[PDB]
C-alpha cells in the first residue's frame, strides 16, 4: 500500500499532480524488521483504491512485474539478417516500388542492410528513406481496416527531452536484489516534450497528400485527424529515449485540411515506467529511473495511418 501525496510544487489546480510522492513499507535484507522508504512515481503507474489517499501499482492487479537490469541498454543497434547455405535473400532495387508485384531490377545478397529494431507507434523513427518521391504502401487501399504504411524521402528533425534531473535511490531489498527508486527531482517540475520544425513538417505533409490523391481522386479533399481512442500505446507516440518510455500527444501533428490545390511545434509528452508491450500479459517491466536530463534527436521517416469508414466515399 502506497500513501502518496502531491510532489513539492506551487499549484495551480490544473497541474493535476501527475508526479506523486509515495511512502510505503519494505522488506530489508533480513526477514524481520521492516523499512519505511519513499519513492516518486508517475500518475500512469499508480492507481488509487478505496485517513490519507491510498494508491497501488497499476500492474499489481494484472500480472507480475520485473525490473530491467541497469547494466543492459535499450539502444537499437543495426542487425543484419542473413540466410543459411543453399538459400539466398533477394533485394528489390527499383526506385518506385509499393512492396507488391514483380520487380524489374533484382539483386541477391547474403545479408540484409543494418536494420535497427526501433519499437515505436504512429511515427516511424530512424528508418530507411524512400527514393525520389515519397511512397504510399497498403495491403488493401479500398479496405479502411488495413493500415497504410508511409515512407518519407526527406527526414523530419524531431527533438525530445526529459526536463527533470532525476535522482536514483538504490533501496536494498536483499539479500542480493536491489530496487532503483526515484529520489527527489533537482530543479523545476517540467514535463517531457518533443519539438518538430513547422517548416519541415509543412512540406512533408504536402508531399504525402499529393501522393494520396493518386489513389483517392485527383481533385479531392484530404483531412488529417488525431487518433480515435483506446489504449495509451495506440493514441500516443510511444517510444524510448535514454531508457525512459515517452508517450507524446500527437494532436498537434494531425490537425489539418488540404484542398486539391518560423519556430517549432512542441508536443506534450508523458512518461511511464511500468510497461506491458507487445500485448503481453504476465510479464510487466519496470523501467529503472534515469539520472539527469535526457536529450535525443531522431529522424521521422514514416507514418502508420488508418482510414475511417464513414462514407460519403467519393467526397472527402
Amino acid at each position, epitope marked *: 500500500t502506497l500513501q502518496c501525496t502531491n510532489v513539492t510544487n*506551487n499549484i*495551480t489546480d490544473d497541474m493535476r499532480g501527475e508526479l506523486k510522492n509515495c511512502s510505503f513499507n519494505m522488506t530489508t535484507e533480513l526477514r524481520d524488521k521492516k523499512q519505511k522508504v519513499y519513492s516518486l512515481f508517475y500518475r500512469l503507474d499508480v492507481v488509487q483504491i478505496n485517513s490519507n489517499k491510498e494508491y497501488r501499482l497499476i500492474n499489481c492487479n494484472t500480472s507480475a512485474i520485473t525490473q530491467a537490469c541497469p547494466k543492459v541498454s535499450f539502444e537499437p543497434i543495426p542487425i543484419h539478417y542473413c540466410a543459411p547455405a543453399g538459400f539466398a535473400i533477394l533485394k528489390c532495387k527499383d526506385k518506385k516500388f509499393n512492396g507488391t508485384g514483380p520487380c524489374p531490377s533484382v539483386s541477391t545478397v547474403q545479408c540484409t542492410h543494418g536494420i535497427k529494431p526501433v519499437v515505436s507507434t504512429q511515427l516511424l523513427l530512424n528508418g530507411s528513406l524512400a527514393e525520389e518521391e515519397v511512397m504510399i504502401r497498403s495491403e488493401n487501399i479500398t479496405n479502411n481496416a488495413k493500415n497504410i504504411l508511409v515512407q518519407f524521402n526527406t527526414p523530419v528533425q524531431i527533438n525530445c527531452t526529459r*526536463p527533470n534531473n532525476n535522482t536514483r535511490k538504490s533501496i536494498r531489498i536483499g539479500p542480493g536484489q536491489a530496487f532503483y527508486a526515484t529520489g527527489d527531482i533537482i530543479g523545476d517540475i517540467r514535463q517531457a516534450h518533443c519539438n518538430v520544425s513547422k517548416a519541415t513538417w509543412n512540406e512533408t505533409l504536402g508531399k504525402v497528400v499529393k501522393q494520396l490523391r493518386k489513389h483517392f481522386g485527383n481533385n479531392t479533399i484530404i483531412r488529417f485527424a488525431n487518433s480515435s481512442g483506446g489504449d495509451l500505446e495506440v493514441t500516443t507516440h510511444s517510444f524510448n529515449c535514454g531508457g525512459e518510455f515517452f508517450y507524446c500527444n500527437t494532436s498537434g501533428l494531425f490537425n489539418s485540411t488540404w484542398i486539391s490545390n518560423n519556430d517549432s511545434i512542441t508536443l506534450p509528452c508523458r512518461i511511464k515506467q511500468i510497461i506491458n508491450m507487445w500485448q503481453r500479459i504476465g510479464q510487466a517491466m519496470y523501467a529503472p529511473p534515469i539520472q539527469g536530463v535526457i536529450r535525443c534527436v531522431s529522424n521521422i521517416t514514416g507514418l502508420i495511418l488508418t482510414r475511417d469508414g464513414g462514407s460519403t466515399n467519393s467526397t472527402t
Partner: antibody, heavy 132, light 108 residues
C-alpha cells in the same frame, strides 16, 4: 516625482480594528500595483499583501482572516483594515508601489513560469503600537 | 537570529540570507539604513535598477543547492547597513516574510 505618505492612529487597543491610509501623490491608483509591508522592532519585514484594480488582490496566508484592503479612486488613496489586533501587530507599516515581473524557465505554453513582485518606490512609513 | 559581517573599507563584502535554494529562484534584495525605509538594491537575482552602482552583485538564481549571496566590491563606510532578501522559489509558496538580514560592519 512619486511621493507616498502614510498616516494612521499610532495607538490601537487590543482586539480592535486598525485602519491606515496611504496618501498618494504623483501617480494614479489604477495604473499601479500597491503593497503594504510591516516590520516589528528588530525583526525582518513581513509582506502584508498586494492590491490592484480589476479585482487582482491577494493577502498573506498568515493574516488571511484579519486583513482587508481597498483602493479609493475618487480620493486617490490606498486604505488598510486589520481586525483583531494583538501585541504582535505592533510594528511600522509601509505603503509602496509595486511592479510585477514574469520569470520564464520552461516552455511558456505549459504555464512553466511564475510571477514575482518587487517594490521600487517606498514611503516614509507610519508607526503603530498596540497597547491598552 | 542576527548575523554580522565585518569587512575592511575598499575590500569585498558577501552576505548570506534566506534558506537553501531548492529550485529556480528570483531573489530580491533590499538595503535598510538605520532609522529609514527599505530601498531596492538588486531585483531578479542580479538586476540593478537605475541608481545602483555595479559594486552590488548577487548570485544568479540558476544554482540549485546554495544560499542567496550578496557581493559588495569596494566596500565603503556608506555601505554600513542591514540587508534583507526576498526568496522567490518555484517549488516553495510565496514567502511573505523576508529572510533574516545580515549587518555589514565597515572596519577602521
Amino acid at each position: 516625482q512619486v511621493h507616498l505618505q502614510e498616516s494612521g492612529p499610532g495607538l490601537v487597543k487590543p482586539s480592535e480594528t486598525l485602519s491606515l491610509t496611504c496618501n498618494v501623490s504623483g501617480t494614479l491608483v489604477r495604473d499601479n500595483y500597491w503593497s503594504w509591508i510591516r516590520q516589528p522592532l528588530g525583526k525582518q519585514p513581513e509582506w502584508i499583501g498586494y492590491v490592484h484594480d480589476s479585482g487582482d488582490t491577494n493577502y498573506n496566508p498568515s493574516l488571511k482572516s484579519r486583513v482587508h484592503l481597498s483602493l479609493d479612486k475618487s480620493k486617490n488613496l490606498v486604505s488598510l483594515r486589520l481586525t483583531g489586533v494583538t501585541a504582535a501587530d505592533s510594528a511600522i507599516y509601509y505603503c509602496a508601489t509595486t511592479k510585477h515581473g514574469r520569470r520564464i524557465y520552461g516552455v511558456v505554453a505549459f504555464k512553466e513560469w511564475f510571477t514575482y513582485f518587487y517594490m521600487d518606490v517606498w514611503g516614509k512609513g507610519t508607526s503603530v503600537t498596540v497597547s491598552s | 537570529a542576527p548575523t554580522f559581517v565585518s569587512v575592511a573599507p575598499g575590500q569585498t563584502a558577501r552576505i548570506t540570507c534566506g534558506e537553501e535554494s531548492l529550485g529556480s529562484r528570483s531573489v530580491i534584495w533590499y538595503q535598510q539604513r538605520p532609522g529609514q525605509a527599505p530601498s531596492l538594491i538588486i531585483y531578479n537575482n542580479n538586476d540593478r535598477p537605475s541608481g545602483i552602482p555595479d559594486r552590488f552583485s548577487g548570485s544568479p538564481g540558476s544554482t540549485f543547492g546554495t544560499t542567496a549571496t550578496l557581493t559588495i566590491t569596494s566596500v565603503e563606510a556608506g555601505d554600513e547597513a542591514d540587508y534583507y532578501c526576498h526568496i522567490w522559489d518555484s517549488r516553495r509558496p510565496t514567502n511573505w516574510v523576508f529572510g533574516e538580514g545580515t549587518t555589514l560592519i565597515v572596519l577602521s
